[PDB]
Amino acid sequence: SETRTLQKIREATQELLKYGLLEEASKPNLYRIVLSHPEEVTRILEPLDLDIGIDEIRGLLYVKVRLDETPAQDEWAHPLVRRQRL
DNA sequence: ATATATATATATATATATATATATATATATATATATATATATATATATATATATATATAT
């Protein structure tokens, strides 16, 4: 049917999901590949209500809930993320 | 003819050396019951989230 996403993008996205972050000092290939395809990464993550926050100064990428603020409740609840309390 | 007494005979008790068989003290090997340790499971609590059912405002 449709074409396939670049294997590097898929791998980096799955890494970022597994660990909830990517680090320039640890996995430079995935980090730079994601940053060079940022629109693609936000497009993939968009329909899960997920988005990437980025930090070039600290060299850190991370996920962040894209739910619009106070969408239905005072403080949101997202099915795929569990809000643990330490 | 019987009874006392004779040298030798019957035969063994004892002695020694020898072997083999058994009893003991000791050393040594294997089986055992238990102590220590790491991963696993149980139940506990703390908190989040999912669920059913209801209160309320609403459609037609």
Report resolution in angstroms: 3.6
Q: Which two tokens stand for residue A44?
A: 């993939």
Report which of A62, A37, A34, A32 is spatially closest to residue A50, judged by C-alpha positions: A62
Contact A64, A52 (CB under 8 A): yes
- Smallest CA–C1' separation from A83, nucleotide: B48
Per the entry, the structure determination technique was cryo-EM
How many residues are recorded in chain A? 86
Which residue ranges have CB below 7 A from strand B? A 77-79, 81-85
3-class secondary structure, A22: strand
Angle at A14 between CA A49 and CA A37, to 5 degrees: 75
- Smallest CA–C1' separation from A78, nucleotide: B49
CA–C1' gap, A34 and B20, in angstroms: 99
The letter for the amino acid at A21 is: L
**Token match 């999901």: residue?**
A17
Report which of A25, A20, A3 is spatially closest to residue A78, judged by C-alpha positions: A20
Contact A83, A77 (CB under 8 A): yes
